[PDB]
């Protein structure tokens with residue numbers, strides 16, 4: 055009583071019901087480094103300008 | 112300071128938009144008006160300097176140098192208009208533009224609050240001076256002269272730049288007003304030794320120090336007359352001004368770093384004055400006398416007492432007026448005989464008596480006749496160096512012998528004796544020439560009435 059599969063059927067992506075748990079860390083990765091702090095706050099003008107040796111702006 | 116900078120810049124459209132017959136008259140008139148305006152800088156206080164802005168200030172050191180600088184431009188125009196009479200009109204305007212540009216760089220060299228802006232104006236003065244010497248100097252040697260003047264300066268001044276930027280990284284500022292209160296003592300080390308040399312050797316070249324002086328009897332001799340006037344009267348004093356500002360930061364290491372240079376100056380004024388006894392070129396004699404006079408200013412700044420700084424700034428102003436007048440007198444004889452050989456045209460008092468009186472007064476101020484400000488500066492430096500070490504009076508007093516001897520020899524050779532027979536083109540003195548001599552000599556003698564304005568910040 056076995057029916058041979060049609061062209062296209064064995065290449066389908068199927069769904070599988072398993073009782074084993076999903077691997078939470080399959081790459082066995084350690085903790086990622088903490089990122090650098092982002093920029094935040096309002097952008098105020100430079101205090102007394104460029105401060106390049108004698109320029110006042 | 113911008114009430115002086117903007118009219119000095121407005122002299123540029125004034126010279127370039129003037130009618131062709133009016134370019135000496137207009138620039139002379141309005142530079143005299145700027146020079147009259149320069150007396151508002153005499154709002155000086157006993158405690159505070161006159162501090163205009165973040166960029167500019169003027170104490171009692173910079174103020175007489177500014178007044179002398181702004182005064183020297185009309186006198187340079189008067190001195191230069193005769194020998195540039197046959198010049199192309201655009202080259203004549205370019206010459207006047209170089210003088211105006213040099214005044215502009217000088218007046219904000221002396222008022223620069225911050226030391227790297229002082230450096231940039233200080234080195235910016237090189238370019239118009241180099242152009243004036245190499246373009247309007249008379250002889251071949253001007254080209255070689257323009258190299259020496261360029262390369263003794265920069266080889267001294269490029270280590271200064273680095274040194275100043277180091278102070279910028281160490282103190283956080285190069286404001287002289289901030290550095291008056293944040294100056295830290297400079298201890299004995301090799302790092303501070305080469306710090307001292309980098310801070311001092313550019314100004315040692317500008318003074319000039321003896322042994323570093325070789326650019327001057329080429330640069331002042333081969334220059335045209337306005338070039339020699341500004342070189343002897345103002346640009347030597349950039350070194351003394353810069354030392355008086357920079358030695359704030361160099362204590363206490365100066366107390367033994369000054370010892371070689373003081374020797375080089377104390378013996379050097381014996382040498383160069385002696386050199387003036389055997390000079391055949393009159394303009395070279397005046398140049399070597401400038402080296403000898405600036406040796407005293409070097410000693411006075413290095414021993415750094417109140418009397419020595421007062422004597423050094425008085426001697427800088429007095430030498431500016433006297434050496435500029437002496438170059439103008441030598442030029443008035445050069446524009447008749449077309450040779451700078453001093454033994455050539457003799458007996459000129461028989462031919463030119465009022466100009467001989469100007470020669471007499473300029474010689475008397477050169478040998479520091481009291482009560483001239485020449486003698487005030489000379490004498491105050493001698494007092495302070497006697498307090499430094501009592502033996503220096505020997506090298507001081509012997510100098511005052513030789514200074515008298517070359518001053519009158521110059522006066523005896525050119526003015527006295529028998530006139531040269533074959534020279535018959537000795538024209539009577541023009542009104543421009545006597546005017547130039549009087550505009551040197553009358554302010555110089557009037558400053559003896561009130562010398563406190565040329566005694567500097569610690570009068």
Ligand SMILES: CCCCCCCCCCCCCCCCCC(=O)OC[C@H](COP(=O)([O-])OC[C@H](O)COP(=O)([O-])OC[C@H](COC(=O)CCCCCCCCCCCCCCCCC)OC(=O)CCCCCCCCCCCCCCCCC)OC(=O)CCCCCCCCCCCCCCCCC
Pocket residue numbers: 108109110111112113116117120121123124163164165166167215219231
């Ligand atoms: C209500 C709405 C309307 C309001 C209107 C208000 C205004 C009304 C009047 C309109 C005109 C305003 C003009 C601008 C304001 C004044 C700016 C000024 O003078 O700054 C002082 C500035 C700093 O002085 P301050 O006392 O501290 O500040 C006073 C103010 O607060 C200065 O203010 P500040 O603190 O904000 O200044 C900012 C900063 C202040 O400066 C700094 O922070 C210090 C650094 C400055 C630069 C230093 C460079 C050093 C190396 C190069 C040297 C150049 C060679 C010299 C010139 C050669 C000849 C061309 O300036 C800069 O960074 C700009 C660079 C310098 C340019 C100045 C403006 C020039 C405009 C006209 C140009 C014409 C040719 C000028 C000559 C060319 C060279 C500049 O002075 C200098 O540095 C000395 C040089 C003088 C500058 C030029 C003077 C401008 C007027 C010239 C007219 C005549 C021209 C003659 C013909 C052409 C020449 C042959």
Ligand SMILES: CCCCCCCCCCCCCCCCCC(=O)OC[C@H](COP(=O)([O-])OC[C@H](O)COP(=O)([O-])OC[C@H](COC(=O)CCCCCCCCCCCCCCCCC)OC(=O)CCCCCCCCCCCCCCCCC)OC(=O)CCCCCCCCCCCCCCCCC
Pocket residue numbers: 464465466468469471472475476480481482483484553556557559560
């Ligand atoms: C604020 C107001 C001030 C008012 C008072 C004035 C203060 C002094 C300012 C300067 C004065 C110099 C002007 C004359 C000399 C230059 C021109 C010349 O040679 O003309 C000859 C000519 C007459 O001769 P000439 O027969 O026709 O022809 C001459 C021959 O070719 C042949 O000529 P020569 O060789 O036979 O004759 C030249 C003769 C030659 O004699 C000498 O060379 C010997 C002089 C040295 C030994 C004697 C004096 C020693 C020191 C004592 C004096 C000072 C202290 C006195 C106080 C008591 C003690 C502490 O010199 C004199 O006789 C001049 C007398 C005054 C000499 C001053 C010292 C010069 C020596 C070197 C520097 C010494 C230290 C500085 C002293 C500064 C004092 C303020 O004179 C005039 O035409 C004079 C023109 C007008 C002069 C105006 C003077 C002031 C100008 C300032 C304008 C702005 C303020 C307004 C005040 C105006 C007041 C009227």
Ligand SMILES: CCCCCCCCCCCCCCCCCC(=O)OC[C@H](COP(=O)([O-])OCC[N+](C)(C)C)OC(=O)CCCCCCCCCCCCCCCCC
Pocket residue numbers: 263266267270273274277302303305306308309312313316
């Ligand atoms: C006109 C002709 C003669 C011109 C003479 C000009 C000055 C002569 C001395 C210049 C030395 C070099 C610049 C020094 C700047 C000082 C800045 C500073 O902080 O120094 C301390 C610093 C100290 O380093 P630091 O400050 O980074 O270290 C931190 C501080 N400690 C030391 C406590 C750890 O000195 C140096 O780094 C080196 C100084 C000596 C440099 C030697 C190389 C140059 C030799 C001289 C060349 C002179 C011109 C040659 C050409 C002649 C003509 C063709």
